[PDB]
């Protein structure tokens, strides 16, 4: 279970490839694998898990 989430983008280039970098700080209840997905169709994330 994730809480106290924050996101910062230190580097971004709008292109066909993964030109954007995002650092997401979180507070997880326990250790485990989490799925990563963009809720906006105009942005796509390289990492799936």
């Amino acid at each position: 279970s994730l809480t106290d989430m924050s996101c910062e983008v230190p580097a971004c280039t709008h292109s066909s490839d993964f030109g954007g970098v995002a650092i997401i700080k979180y507070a997880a209840s326990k250790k485990g694998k989490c799925a990563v997905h963009s809720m906006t169709n105009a942005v796509t994330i390289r990492e799936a898990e």
């Binding site: 910062e8 983008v9 230190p10 580097a11 971004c12 970098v21 995002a22 650092i23």
Partner: protein, 49 residues
């Protein structure tokens, strides 16, 4: 009777040299500068503190 040379009388702070005859560092107007900085010199916002 020659008086002061161009090194002393010239406007815009011109420095005058010989062999070859030339005007150096003319104190006058402005100078546009174009620098094509390579991709490797830059650090992404995410990669920066």
């Amino acid at each position: 009777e020659r008086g002061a040379s161009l090194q002393h009388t010239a406007p815009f702070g011109c420095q005058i040299a010989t062999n070859p005859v030339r005007a150096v560092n003319c104190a006058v107007g402005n100078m546009p500068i174009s620098i094509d900085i390579p991709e490797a010199a830059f650090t992404r916002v995410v990669d920066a503190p």
